[PDB]
Design a protein around this ligand. Structure first.
Ligand SMILES: *[C@@H]1O[C@H](CO)[C@@H](O)[C@H](O)[C@H]1NC(C)=O
Ligand SMILES: *[C@@H]1O[C@H](CO)[C@@H](O)[C@H](O)[C@H]1NC(C)=O
Ligand SMILES: *[C@@H]1O[C@H](CO)[C@@H](O)[C@H](O)[C@H]1NC(C)=O
Ligand SMILES: *[C@@H]1O[C@H](CO)[C@@H](O)[C@H](O)[C@H]1NC(C)=O
Ligand SMILES: *[C@@H]1O[C@H](CO)[C@@H](O)[C@H](O)[C@H]1NC(C)=O
Ligand SMILES: *[C@@H]1O[C@H](CO)[C@@H](O)[C@H](O)[C@H]1NC(C)=O
Ligand SMILES: *[C@@H]1O[C@H](CO)[C@@H](O)[C@H](O)[C@H]1NC(C)=O
Ligand SMILES: *[C@@H]1O[C@H](CO)[C@@H](O)[C@H](O)[C@H]1NC(C)=O
Ligand SMILES: *[C@@H]1O[C@H](CO)[C@@H](O)[C@H](O)[C@H]1NC(C)=O
Ligand SMILES: *[C@@H]1O[C@H](CO)[C@@H](O)[C@H](O)[C@H]1NC(C)=O
Ligand SMILES: *[C@@H]1O[C@H](CO)[C@@H](O)[C@H](O)[C@H]1NC(C)=O
Ligand SMILES: *[C@@H]1O[C@H](CO)[C@@H](O)[C@H](O)[C@H]1NC(C)=O
Lengths: 135, 135, 135
């Protein structure tokens, strides 16, 4: 939330990086570093806090009631045949793949019907995605 | 939220980077660094806070009621055949792929019907996406 | 939440990295480092806090009631045959794969119907994804 970074190869504060086939002969490197850091991140100062939720019923006549959740799946048909016919023939399959519904990252918070919150919520995702690499 | 960065290859504060086939002969590098940092990020100052939610019923007559969630899927048909017929023939498949519904990043917060919030919510996603690389 | 980083290869504070075939002959490296760090992360200061939830019924007549959860799956059919017919033929399959529903990361918090929160919730995911690599 404060210092989120994505670094590809190299990350450094003071780097005298050297690489292939070099001559580092008579250098006189000298440093003088002062790097004081002060974090006072999201400190609270609270006197009172109330989360109230009341449901009062009475003399109440209620018929059919349906409150369904935050994702319903109904009558979902996946209908993928795969028919191969081959008479006196030559076939060559490489990097052949058939994928159906598939997920890599699935993150859910506060997936309800009724919710009362107080706080600080984060979701951070850092990757190097590579699905198909055939060659 | 404050210092979000995406770095491709190299990230540094003071970098005397050297690369292929060089002559670093009589240099007299000298540094003098003062890098004081003060973070007071989202500090609160609160005397009172109330999250009130009331539902009062009474002498109330209610018929059919339906409150459905924040994503419904109904009668979704995926109908992808794949028929190959080959008589006395030559076939060559490489980097051949059939993909159906597929996700990589799925993040959800506060997916409800009724919600009362108080706070600080973030979603950060940093990647290097590469779906198909065949060659 | 404060210092989240994704580093590809190298991470360092002060790195005199050297690589292939080099001459590091008469250097006079010198350092002087002061790196005081002070973290006071999310310290609270609270006098009172109440999470109240009441449900009062009485003289109440209720018919059919259905409150279903935050994800229902109903009548989901996966119908993927795979028929191969081969008379007097040559077939070659390599890196051949058929995948059905599949997940790698599944994280859920506060997946309910009714929820009252107070606090600090995080989800962090860092990876190097590589699904198919055949070659
Ligand atoms: C630096 O090193 C070289 C070596 O080739 C030498 O000839 C030269 O006198 C040196 N000078 C100092 C100031 O160290
Ligand atoms: C290096 O930094 C310190 C920190 O204040 C300072 O007192 C000093 O004069 C600087 N130089 C040297 C040569 O030490
Ligand atoms: C608010 O400020 C600081 C905490 O950050 C503290 O010294 C002060 O007493 C707080 N005030 C109250 C009323 O709590
Ligand atoms: C709703 O309630 C009535 C009763 O008044 C009932 O006849 C009907 O079947 C209910 N609805 C469903 C979908 O069952
Ligand atoms: C720097 O190094 C070179 C080496 O080729 C030398 O001839 C020269 O006298 C040096 N000078 C100083 C100031 O160090
Ligand atoms: C380096 O920085 C410090 C910090 O204030 C300063 O006192 C000093 O004069 C600077 N120069 C040297 C040569 O130390
Ligand atoms: C608000 O300001 C600071 C906290 O940031 C604190 O010193 C002060 O007392 C706070 N005021 C009240 C009324 O809490
Ligand atoms: C709605 O309620 C009536 C009762 O008055 C019922 O006949 C009807 O079937 C209900 N609707 C559905 C879709 O069931
Ligand atoms: C540095 O090392 C070289 C070795 O080739 C030498 O000739 C030179 O006199 C040295 N100088 C110092 C200042 O150490
Ligand atoms: C190194 O840093 C310290 C820390 O303040 C300082 O007292 C000193 O003068 C600096 N230089 C040397 C040569 O020690
Ligand atoms: C709030 O500020 C600090 C804690 O961060 C503490 O010294 C002070 O007494 C706190 N105030 C109250 C009323 O608790
Ligand atoms: C709803 O309740 C009525 C009674 O009044 C009943 O006849 C009906 O079958 C119920 N609904 C379902 C779907 O069973």
């Amino acid at each position: 939330s404060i210092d989120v970074k994505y670094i590809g190869v190299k990350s450094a504060y003071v780097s005298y990086d050297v690489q292939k086939r070099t001559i580092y002969l008579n250098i006189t490197n000298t440093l003088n570093i002062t790097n004081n850091n002060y974090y006072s991140v999201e400190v609270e100062n609270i006197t009172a806090q109330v989360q109230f939720s009341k449901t009062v019923i009475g003399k109440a006549r209620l018929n059919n009631i349906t409150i369904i959740g935050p994702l319903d799946m109904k009558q979902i048909d996946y209908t993928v045949p795969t028919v191969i016919a081959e008479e006196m023939s030559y076939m060559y399959d490489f990097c052949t793949l058939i994928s159906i519904k598939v997920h890599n990252i699935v993150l859910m918070m506060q997936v309800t019907v009724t919710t009362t919150y107080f706080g600080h919520s984060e979701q951070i995702s850092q990757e190097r995605y590579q699905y198909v690499d055939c060659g």
